[PDB]
Every structure is written in structure tokens, then in C-alpha cells.
Point group: C2
Chain length 78, copies 2
């Protein structure tokens, strides 16, 4: 094993380490992005479910009003 | 100047390092694929909830026009 070949092996491997560290940094940051996205989506789901609950309530209320008005008309017909 | 042995160990160490960092990036890659799947399902859920909210919107409008008609009927009778 000649010292020149060894020194070049070291040079190459060190380049490699730097490269893969860059790639890992990239992946880590991307990971944080995906995580943020998951958070926002989950929040959006919670909001949508609150909206859905609100709609269920407004509609049930309207159905009871209709039931009442229909009942009234029923009385004005008999 | 560095010993052929010294160089051999720097090489040893660097190779261990590369293998380590590669394992780590593999881990991150798989974790990433997970995050993307998760995001997919969440977005799909958002689609279903928005469809449901649309359905509730239509039903809401139908109940409101029905309500208005009934009010009108009550007005014409008494
Ligand atoms: K070598
Ligand atoms: K290499
Ligand atoms: K890390
Ligand atoms: K060295
Ligand atoms: K090292
Ligand atoms: K890669």
C-alpha cells in the first residue's frame, strides 16, 4: 500500500462523507417540512369537523322548525 | 508525514463513518416515505370531509327553501 494511494483514498472518502452529510441535511429539513404539512393538515381536519358539527346543528334546528310549521299548517287545515 | 498504518486507520474510520451515515439516510428515507403516505391519507380525509360539508350545504339550502315555503303557506292561510 503506497502512501499516495492511501492519501488519495482518504481524500476521496472525506469528500464522500461531506457529500452524504449534505444529503442528510437535505433529508432532515425536508422531513421537517413534511412534519409541518402533517400538522397543518390535521388542524384542517379538526376545523372541518367543527364546521361539520355546526352544519349538523343548524340543519337539525331547521328540521325542528319545519316540523313545527308543518304541524301548524296541519292545524289550519283540519 | 503519516504512517502507512496511521493512514490505514484514517481510512478504516472514514469507511465506518460513511457506512453509518448511509444507514442514517436510509432511516430518514423510509421515515420520509411514511410521512408522505400519512400526508396522502390526511389529504384524502380532507376530501371526504369537504364532500360531506357540501352535502350538508345542499341539505341546508333545501331545508331553508322548504322553511320559506311553509312560512309563506302559513301567511296565506292565516
Ligand atoms: K484502500
Ligand atoms: K468512494
Ligand atoms: K442526524
Ligand atoms: K490524515
Ligand atoms: K471521523
Ligand atoms: K439518497
Amino acid at each position: 500500500a503506497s502512501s499516495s494511494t492511501l492519501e488519495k483514498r482518504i481524500e476521496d472518502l472525506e469528500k464522500e462523507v461531506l457529500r452524504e452529510r449534505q444529503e442528510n441535511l437535505r433529508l432532515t429539513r425536508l422531513m421537517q417540512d413534511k412534519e409541518e404539512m402533517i400538522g397543518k393538515l390535521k388542524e384542517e381536519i379538526d376545523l372541518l369537523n367543527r364546521d361539520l358539527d355546526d352544519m349538523e346543528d343548524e340543519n337539525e334546528q331547521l328540521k325542528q322548525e319545519n316540523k313545527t310549521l308543518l304541524k301548524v299548517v296541519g292545524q289550519l287545515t283540519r
